[PDB]
Write a protein that binds this ligand. Structure first.
Ligand code: HEM
Ligand code: HEM
Ligand code: HEM
Ligand code: HEM
Ligand code: ZN
Ligand code: ZN
Ligand code: ZN
Ligand code: ZN
Ligand code: ZN
Ligand code: ZN
Lengths: 106, 106, 106, 106
């Protein structure tokens, strides 16, 4: 999917996590976020169109999706324990990774 | 040291990282931050004085220092590679862990 | 590719890493291992044919591939620093993750 | 305590974990291993007596204790979920970190 449509599924499943009532629903939504991030990993953002795929801005942009995937995985451990409320809080914290990359490249 | 004096050394070495010129100076300051966090790990904050050491607020408060120590360690890998500028950026990102705990417990 | 062919590329590239002479060759071989491990992540092993895709043996089997990939990624940082020898040593340690999963499921 | 006595508590508590019957006993033994590993973090091994405290053998030696501690911590999450058997299995995998460091420095 294009970059805009991956961002949208990331933004929508964050909201779905806030309002969830059980672990299977948190699990479902985090899984969808992981696949969206993995698909986004290979795109070129508009603000970087004139750069080389080997350029440190592109390398840094890629790596931000690898950290996000790492944080979603750790949230997935807390849903499998039954510790649902912590899982929901770790999910909200993910905004930090979102904003840090938005500041440089959105 | 008391909680206030550990916070102060954490706050001061963040500023020292911004303005550093080489790897040995970033290394030095991150090391100091790690020891301050490890010393803070066992304190009771004012807003939690009436709670049991086994209580989920205390357990959650402790765990926030374990994540911070984990992030400082990863910043230390980037200073040892010579990749000084990335190390400085990972350091700024640490504010997220700072604020998230401040929101609940400062 | 099938599970057998993925295991064979994993096994072959371990040997190529032992005998390498520069960082580009370590990098090339590690990259091929990551892609083999990502494809294998979605297979069903023979000894598990009679189980459900949601069953804790399957979920654990998947999870062994994620750890493998995380350790291959850290080895890739060591090759990009020019620290070739340390990279080679981190590659030999991967055997622990290979053997653990073979013990339960090969 | 000295390095030898720390290794002996590490070795003893591995055996206690094998033979445990409930989560409180796994928890107790893992906790004693973490503290042994934290004390050992600042020792100098005999085979390294002639080296500088800033020397890459010493820095690598220290780093093996940090990884050990990180793997003991994750095992502690598994005991607190009530997933006792998985905890026991994660404890047996620690041998990989024990052996790797023995190969270079014992
Ligand atoms: C859960 C985390 C994230 C959320 C919820 C999120 C959300 C969004 C949203 C709602 C947009 C607006 C898209 C539109 O115009 O319809 C956007 C754009 C964008 N995001 Fe994210 N984002 C996240 C993480 C990231 C990360 C980690 C990166 C980089 C590594 C990133 C890079 C970008 C870029 C470059 C755009 C501009 C796209 C364009 O204008 O075509 N985002 N994001
Ligand atoms: C690098 C990260 C951090 C920085 C730079 C920082 C900075 C500060 C500063 C400047 C203060 C004001 C202290 C004063 O009154 O003189 C403070 C207070 C406090 N911080 Fe942090 N902090 C950090 C991380 C954390 C974390 C991770 C936690 C919890 C896990 C935390 C918990 C608190 C609490 C409870 C107070 C209130 C202390 C009191 O009023 O006695 N902080 N911090
Ligand atoms: C660098 C790491 C690894 C190496 C070098 C490796 C090597 C091998 C080799 C040589 C085989 C024999 C294939 C054949 O019959 O031709 C095999 C099979 C197998 N491996 Fe691995 N392996 C690795 C990691 C893993 C991991 C992480 C898992 C599980 C998460 C795994 C699961 C299996 C299974 C289930 C088989 C049996 C396949 C069958 O009989 O069809 N392996 N592996
Ligand atoms: C659960 C993990 C470990 C176990 C069970 C273990 C066990 C042992 C044992 C039984 C000894 C023999 C002590 C004696 O002579 O009485 C020993 C020595 C030693 N261990 Fe470990 N070990 C572990 C982890 C580590 C790690 C992570 C390191 C390094 C980072 C390490 C470094 C050493 C060294 C240097 C010695 C030699 C000490 C001397 O000769 O005085 N060990 N260990
Ligand atoms: Zn990385
Ligand atoms: Zn995991
Ligand atoms: Zn933890
Ligand atoms: Zn490390
Ligand atoms: Zn496939
Ligand atoms: Zn001591």
């Amino acid at each position: 999917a294009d970059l805009e449509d991956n961002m949208e599924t990331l933004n929508d499943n964050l909201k779905v996590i806030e309002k969830a009532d059980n672990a299977a629903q948190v699990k479902d939504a985090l899984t969808k976020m992981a696949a969206a991030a993995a698909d986004a990993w290979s795109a070129t953002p508009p603000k970087l169109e004139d750069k080389s795929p080997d350029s440190p801005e592109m390398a840094d942009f890629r790596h931000g999706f690898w950290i996000l995937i790492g944080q979603i995985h750790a949230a997935l451990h807390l849903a499998n324990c039954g510790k649902v409320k912590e899982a929901q809080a770790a999910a909200e914290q993910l905004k930090c990774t979102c904003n840090a990359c938005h500041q440089k490249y959105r």
